[PDB]
Amino acid sequence: GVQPPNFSWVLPGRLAGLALPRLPAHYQFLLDLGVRHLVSLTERGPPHSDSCPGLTLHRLRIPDFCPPAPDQIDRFVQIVDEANARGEAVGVHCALGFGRTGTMLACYLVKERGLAAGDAIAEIRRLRPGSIETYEQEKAVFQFYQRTK
Numbered sequence: 001g002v003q004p005p006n007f008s009w010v011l012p013g014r015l016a017g018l019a020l021p022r023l024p025a026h027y028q029f030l031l032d033l034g035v036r037h038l039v040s041l042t043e044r045g046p047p048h049s050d051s052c053p054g055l056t057l058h059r060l061r062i063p064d065f066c067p068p069a070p071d072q073i074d075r076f077v078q079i080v081d082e083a084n085a086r087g088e089a090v091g092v093h094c095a096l097g098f099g100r101t102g103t104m105l106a107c108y109l110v111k112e113r114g115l116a117a118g119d120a121i122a123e124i125r126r127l128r129p130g131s132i133e134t135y136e137q138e139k140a141v142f143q144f145y146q147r148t149k
Helices: 024-032 070-085 100-113 117-127 133-147
Strands: 008-011 015-016 035-040 054-060 090-094
Touching: 008 100, 008 117, 015 100, 024 035, 035 070, 070 090, 070 100, 070 133, 090 100, 100 117, 100 133, 117 133
Parallel strands: 015 090, 035 054, 035 090
Antiparallel strands: 008 015
């Protein structure tokens, strides 16, 4: 197994972020750490994902340099909740693992850890320096918090 680029846990044993996986060894690495679900945010599916039939790919396509749509975030949350309900960890990736990935990660903290948007964005940036760099990305988290209370 080979650790995928920019990989790190946000919620130990439950949720992790990563850059674009592109080799069979990347997916095998995820499976070894218990990450049985991969939420893919890129415009196209990541290469060689089918090498590991045991890993479930969840395609939630979000255009490059754009924020996630409200319904997409709700779906992301649902996916993480159901996976963790089965004792399985989830990994979420985009192209670089900072923008779209960072926004999703922060949104789960808002929902699952009850954090305010600002603090959720700060924690993600602390764990993964460089995350949620754009205003639209921050905006996505704040509006999610607004409809999550």
